Amino acid sequence: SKYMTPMQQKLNEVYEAVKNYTDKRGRRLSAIFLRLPSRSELPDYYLTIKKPMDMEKIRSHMMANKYQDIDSMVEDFVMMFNNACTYNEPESLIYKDALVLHKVLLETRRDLEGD
Numbered sequence: 001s002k003y004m005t006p007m008q009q010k011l012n013e014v015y016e017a018v019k020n021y022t023d024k025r026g027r028r029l030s031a032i033f034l035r036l037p038s039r040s041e042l043p044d045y046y047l048t049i050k051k052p053m054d055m056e057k058i059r060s061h062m063m064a065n066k067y068q069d070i071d072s073m074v075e076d077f078v079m080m081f082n083n084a085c086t087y088n089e090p091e092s093l094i095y096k097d098a099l100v101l102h103k104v105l106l107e108t109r110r111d112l113e114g115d
């Protein structure tokens with residue numbers, strides 16, 4: 001069925017809000033977060049980050065219909081942002097972007113509180 005339940009629509013809107021957010025200069029903050037690079041490409045990432053997470057993984061779980069609720073999806077986003085903030089330095093752009101996107105995530109959830 002092409003029709004999403006309300007819970008599915010909400011999950012999609014949250015996801016899409018983070019994905020599509022662009023700053024005043026037209027930059028899409030989510031670009032770097034979509035797909036994690038490999039073990040070779042990011043030294044020490046997978047030894048040091050306990051639960052790797054990227055937006056493609058989140059998107060797949062959503063498409064397979066495995067978030068039972070909004071908080072579960074939020075959890076995964078927060079894990080991703082924390083991972084990025086653990087691995088990268090505060091001065092790095094990825095770290096700054098993770099902070100903005102975290103605010104985008106919570107604002108969006110909060111805005112959709114009564115759907």
Ligand SMILES: O=c1cc(-c2ccc(O)c(O)c2)oc2cc(O)cc(O)c12
Nearest residue numbers: 032033034035036053054055083084087
């Ligand atoms: O730390 C992360 C770092 C990167 C990353 C992606 C592309 C690059 O050219 C780069 O120099 C770093 O991508 C991520 C993507 C994520 O979803 C989560 C992360 O923690 C990272």
Ligand SMILES: [K+]
Nearest residue numbers: 085086088089
């Ligand atoms: K750090």
